[PDB]
C-alpha cells in the first residue's frame, strides 16, 4: 500500500480546511447515476486533479470530481467517477477515498452502481438492493486490505458478513412502496469480477451457481475498507442489462446498451436516493 | 501494459519488411502439436528472439519461431512455442503477438492447446471443440486488457459470449465425418486456471460443478484479445488425459504422459488443421 | 521470484553450521499451536532476523524464530510464526523456509493452522485432518511456483492429486482413538482464500458448495512447494471457528474468538502432534 497514515490525514486536512463543509454520508455514483450532483444545495466542487494524493484520473472522462453539499437535510460529498481495477489501479487506490472520507467525518457510505442480471426474474431498469456480495478477486488475493494493517483505521482480520445495514435495507424498501412503483424493489447478492470484458455464456452459469444475483466490477472493495472504518453501508444496483445465459440466442452486452439503461433510470434513481437520505441516522 | 501502440507497429512493420508473406490466419500451435510446421509450402522462419519486442523465451525449449507460410492454399503464420502466465509473464507479453497478427494483417486466429479431461466421457486421443471457455484468472484480475485501453485496436468493454466462431465450429464436424474417425468430435468448455501445478482431486470436482469440459493453462488470454480485435476465433484441445477424480485411485498427471499424447496425436491433429483451412473464409 | 538456488544454499549452510541439529522433520505452527516448541529437547533457537534470506516478519508479533530440537525421538525444526499473502508477501517468500528444510535434510513437513468451519458437523474444537485442498489463489495465478522452474528441486508441472500422505492419515487415526477422545477425529478438504477480511455469509456459500470442509488464509502454498520438493506431508486444522451461514444470525468472525479457541485446544494439539512423530517412518 503506497499510503502511510499520513496521505490519509493531509488529504483530508486539505479538504478539511478547503470547505466549511462537514460531511456525514459519503456517495459513490456508479456508471450514469452521477446525475444526483444536481440535487445538493450549496454545492462545492473539488476535481480530483486538485486533491492532494487522489488516484489521478487516467482518460476515461477526465471528470472526476468531489462534490459536496446537502441532499434533503444531510451534509453529503459525492464521488462523480470511481476508479477500476479494470484501469490498472491497485485497490489501495481504488479504495483511498473512502479512508479520506472516513477521516473527514462521514459515518456512512453509499454505493450505487450498473450491472448485469443474473437472477432471471430480474430486468433492465430494475434496482436490486445488495444484501450480500461474492468478492471473486479477494479469494484469489486482491483485497484491498492486503499488507501490514494500520490498527488506527481498523482489526487485522475485520468480518463481512455483515457488510450491508439491515436497518437501512429494510427502510429502503419502505419509502419504494411510498412511492407506489409498478416493479417491486429488488434484493440480492452482488458477484464482483475484474473485468474488463464481458462474462462469456459459461461465464454467467457459473456466477449463477455460486448464487450471484447481480454482477459487477466495482464496490466490493470500497464495502471493505468501509467497514474496515466503522462506517454504515448501503448501496444498490442498476440492473442495466441481463446477462447472455444461452448458446442459441442473438444478443451481446455493450456499454451502450448499458449507459442507455443508466440514461432512462436516471431520475428515477436519484428521487430514489435523495428520498432515502432522511432514513439515515444522525 | 509496457507496450505502447508504437511497439505493436514497429514490431508489423518489421515483419512486413522481412518477408513478401502477408498472412490472413495466425495459428498458434499448443503444446506437442508444432509439427503443422512441417505441412508449410515455401516456410519463412523467424526466431522470437530476432523479432523486436518479441517476449523472449525463458528457458523452456529455446525454439521459439514465427513460421509463415502457405498451408491449403492460405496464407498463414505459425507460433511454434508460446508464452504461459505460469513462466512469469504477464498477460499483456502472453498475448503481444495476437495484436501483432493484427497489424500485420490476420483476420483469423486458430488456437491450439493440450488440455485435461473433466467430462467423463472424453478419452486420451480425443479432440475436444472449443464452444466456450471460463476465465477464472480473469474473474480475480489477471486479464490482458487490463489497464488504459487502446481504442485503436478495440473497446474497453468486449463481449466475449460470441467468442468461438459458430460457422467453424460446424464446419470443423462436417470434415471429421468427411475423415470417417471412429470417435466423434468432442465440443465444450474450455477452463483456464495459471498452473503450473497440477489439479488436486478437489480441484477437479470444483472445475467439473463449474461446468468445465477440459481444463489447460493458455489460451484464453489470447482469445480475449484476439476478440477485442476483431478477429474469428476458432481452436480445439487435444485431451491428453483424464484429470484424477477419486481418492481411491493410484494414477497421477505428468509431463510424461502428456507429450506421449501429443506425439501419437500428432499428424492426425495437422491434417485436421490443415484440412480446415479450406473452410475458413476468404 | 527473487531467490536464486544459491540463496537457497546459503541460507541452508549458514544454519548447517550454526547448529549441530540436522533435521528430519518440519513443523509449522499455525496460529496459537506454536506451544509445540515447548515439547522440544535440546531446543536451539534461532529469530528469523538472524537468518540470512529470511523474509523479515512487518510487525505481527516480533516472534518469528526457527526452533530445533527433538520432539518424541525425531530430529525436529520448528516455524514459531509463518508468512501470509494477506500480509502482502509474494508466496515465494511466505514459502521459503520449506526450500531451506529441504536442502538442510528434512524429508516430512507437517503443517497445521486455524480455520473455520464449513462442513456443518464440525464443532469448535474439533481437529480435522487435511485429505486434499482446493487452491483458490493458485486458479487465478498465485502459485509459489510460478516464474521459471529450478530443476533442481523439482518438476516443471508437478502432480497435487497425491499431496497429502495417505500413510499418515491412516495411523494419526489409529493414534487418536488411543486417546479416547470423546469427538471422533475430523477428515476432508482444506480451501485456502488469500484473506485478510472474513467470508460473507454469501462466500460461506461458495466454499461449501465448491465442497470445502474448513476454510484459512494459508498452508497451501508450503504444501505445494513441499510437494515440489519430494517432501511427505502432513497437516490438519483446528476448527476454531464455525463459518456463519444464516442472515437471521447475529454471530461475526473474530481473531479473539479464533485465538480463545486455539488457547483452550492448546495441549490437545502438542500431544497429539508430538505422538504421530512416532508414525513418521524414518
Ligand atoms: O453484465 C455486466 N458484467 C460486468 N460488469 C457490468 C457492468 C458495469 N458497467 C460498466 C461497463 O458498462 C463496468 O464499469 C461494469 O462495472 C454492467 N453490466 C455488467
Ligand atoms: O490436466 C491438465 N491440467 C492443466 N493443464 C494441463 C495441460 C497443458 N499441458 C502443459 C503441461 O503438460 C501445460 O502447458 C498445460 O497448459 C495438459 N493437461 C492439463
Ligand atoms: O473462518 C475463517 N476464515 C479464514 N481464515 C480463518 C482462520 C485463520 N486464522 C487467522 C485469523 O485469526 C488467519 O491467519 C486465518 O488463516 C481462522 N478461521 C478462519
Known sequence: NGYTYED??????????HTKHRPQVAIICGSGLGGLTDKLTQAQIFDYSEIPNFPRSTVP?????????????????MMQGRFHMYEGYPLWKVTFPVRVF??????????????????????????????????????????????????????????????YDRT???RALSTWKQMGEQRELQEGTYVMVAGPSF???????????????????????????????????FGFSLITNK??????????????????????????????????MASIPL
Open 8 to 17: 490519509y490525514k493531509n488529504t483530508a486536512e486539505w479538504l478539511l480546511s
Open 61 to 77: 472522462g477526465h471528470a472526476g470530481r468531489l462534490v459536496f453539499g446537502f441532499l434533503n437535510g444531510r451534509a453529503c460529498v
Open 102 to 163: 472516513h477521516l473527514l467525518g462521514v459515518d456512512t457510505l453509499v454505493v450505487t452502481n450498473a450491472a448485469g442480471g443474473l437472477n432471471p426474474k430480474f430486468e433492465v431498469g430494475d434496482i436490486m438492493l445488495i444484501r450480500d456480495h461474492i468478492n471473486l478477486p479477494g479469494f484469489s488475493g486482491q483485497n484491498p486490505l492486503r499488507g501490514p494493517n494500520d490498527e488506527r483505521f481498523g482489526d487485522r482480520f475485520p468480518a463481512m458478513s455483515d457488510a
Open 168 to 170: 437501512m435495507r429494510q
Open 199 to 233: 462474462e462469456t455464456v459459461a461465464e454467467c452459469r457459473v456466477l449463477q451457481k455460486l448464487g450471484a444475483d447481480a454482477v459487477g466490477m466495482s464496490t466490493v472493495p470500497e464495502v471493505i475498507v468501509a467497514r474496515h472504518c466503522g462506517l454504515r453501508v
Open 243 to 276: 446477462v447472455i445465459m444461452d448458446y442459441e440466442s442473438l444478443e451481446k452486452a455493450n456499454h451502450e446498451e448499458v449507459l442507455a439503461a443508466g440514461k432512462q433510470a436516471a431520475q428515477k434513481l436519484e428521487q430514489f436516493v435523495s428520498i432515502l
